[PDB]
Each structure stands twice: as C-alpha cells, then as structure tokens.
Design a protein around this ligand. Sequence first.
Ligand code: NA
Ligand code: NA
Ligand code: NA
Ligand code: NA
Ligand code: NA
Ligand code: NA
Length: 371
Amino acid sequence: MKIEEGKLVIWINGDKGYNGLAEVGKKFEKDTGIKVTVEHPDKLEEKFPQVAATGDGPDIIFWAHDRFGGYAQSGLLAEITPDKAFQDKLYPFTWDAVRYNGKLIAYPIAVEALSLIYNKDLLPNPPKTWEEIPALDKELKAKGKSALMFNLQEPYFTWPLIAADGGYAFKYENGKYDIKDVGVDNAGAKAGLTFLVDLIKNKHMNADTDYSIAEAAFNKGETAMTINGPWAWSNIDTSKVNYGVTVLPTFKGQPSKPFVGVLSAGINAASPNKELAKEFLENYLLTDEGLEAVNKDKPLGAVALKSYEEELAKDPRIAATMENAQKGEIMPNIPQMSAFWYAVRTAVINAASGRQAVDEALKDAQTRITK
Ligand code: NA
Ligand code: NA
Ligand code: NA
Ligand code: NA
Ligand code: NA
Ligand code: NA
C-alpha cells in the first residue's frame, strides 16, 4: 500500500528524544513483531501536509498541538479513540489542546510554558507578585544589579503579564473557539500592558530588551530574574549562577497566563495501521517506562501523563513548568491565531515606545484580530 500496512513509521523533530522513542519502538516490535521506524526529517512540519495530502507519509507525526489545527482542517489526522479510563490518565487540560472542531485528533505527550527563572544568590525569595517588582528593582539597582530582564520584543514573552488580569486570545468553549470573543483590548489586557509600559517608563526595564540581552544578563549574574522556558535551562551557566525556576508572579492577584504548547502525537488519516498506532501510543509510549525512555534522551519537560509527571515533578523546575502551564492559556489551534501574533506584537512595541497609548494600541490589535 501507499503507506505500508503492518509497520509503523513515526516522524518526530530532530530536537526531541528520537533515540529514546526508537527504544520504545523496539519494545513494541519485540511484543508484536511489527517494525517501528523513527525518522526526523528536516522541515517535517512542512513536509507532512504535503505528503499526507496525497495519502502518503508517516503513520504517526509528533509536533506542538497548535500546528495540528491546520492539519485537522485538511483532514490529515485520524480521530483518535481513547476510552474514558485512558483519558483519565492524562491531565484534563491537555485533551483540550488536541481537540479540533470538537473531535480528538491527537494524543498529548508533553507540556511547555514559560516560568520565572531566578538567581538564588541575588534573590533567594523571589517575588510572588508583579506589583512587588518595582520596589525590588530599586533595591537591587542600589547594589549594582537589576530585578528582571526578559524579552520584550515578542508577545509570547509579554503576554503572561498582559493577560493575567483577564486577557485572552480567543474564548474556548465545547472543544471549539469563538472567533468573535477576543480578549485583547479588555480592561484586564489594558491593565497588564499599562503595568508593563510603566515598568519601562519608571526605568525598571529598557524597551529594547530582547532575548539575547535577557539571557546574557541573567547568565552573567547582572539581573536577579528572567522569564524563559525549558529550552533555556541547559544554556544557563550553572557555574556562575545557582538558579531556580518557579511560578510566575501574579498581577492584581491573578496568575500570569503564559501560552501552553502541548507536544502531541497524531495518526495519519491515510494510515492503514491505526489500531497499531493506538496500541503503540497508549500502551507503550504513554506509560512511565515509555516517557522515561524519551525523557532520558532529550527532556520532555512536564508531561501529560499524571503517573510520570508525579515522578518528574520531584525536579522543582518541572513542577514549576506544569504549575505555570495549568494556570496558563492553551495556544489556540485555529487559523485566526496568526492574526493575533502580529497584531499584538505591533501593539506592545508601539505602547512600550510611546508611539501609541496603551488603550489605542490594544484597540487597533483587537480590530485586526476580529476583522
Ligand atoms: Na525499530
Ligand atoms: Na511577596
Ligand atoms: Na497520581
Ligand atoms: Na520511577
Ligand atoms: Na488613565
Ligand atoms: Na474594541
């Protein structure tokens, strides 16, 4: 057949633990006699919709859930059939990330979100609120340091604060998103962006701080805190910096709302191996031993499977990742989300520089996203 019956071909990106996944496949092959081939093609997220559109490609694809919206719109993904008992083995918010048009189209694997990263030697008790941070910065500036540096140029990094007091991208209801219910220019978003702009106006942050500056400042020990994700941990210079990772600060008593990415496993709609793929994903990969094999190769971060997350969370960085993810916002998987990134990027830049008042900046963004 076009996709070969009686084997599994799996695509996963080259920055994931594909050797560990291959070992899960080897266990599957020993139990079933079914060959499992793990591949990590370049540009696989672009290749997959091309080959799957002709009924070809891998049996299983692994990618962040938000890309699977577009795949599901094109009918590239099988509706999966986990029973209710299996569903109860994963944190319930992860299933929401893999619903499209009401139907489950993938298995959640792992969970990623921003956290507050802090220098224990500069700040052994990091702030629980954003409101504390101006006064803390003044104290640290007096001793030659700063409180907080993070990427202000990209809304992925500023949204956690902007949205804390009631902002949101699109309202989620019943496995679907309301494209008319956008939370970009409401009073909560205005409050959060005002607080951010005030941090800049009061000289606690510089409006041109980007990813490079924040990472370098924190790694040099110049700033007590940054905001970044699990991809950054390996790069933190632990020779210079005894760092911790914790829950993001609250604003107006409300948690920060980082976007959540859920690494997910979809089954090709054209696969003749859908029962094999289900068996592999449910009863080999989504087990403590299967996730351990992948994680030992390249860390997954926090995971969707409760039994293994409860083990991983002995690492406080992973516990913090999951806490911030549970309080955060699943990234919408709908096409209108592309309008969100560029509209909000523009709004925050214009607000932080003074080109636009906060209110008019967010109003213009709201209009574009809802057009
Ligand atoms: Na194999
Ligand atoms: Na406090
Ligand atoms: Na448990
Ligand atoms: Na264990
Ligand atoms: Na005002
Ligand atoms: Na409006």
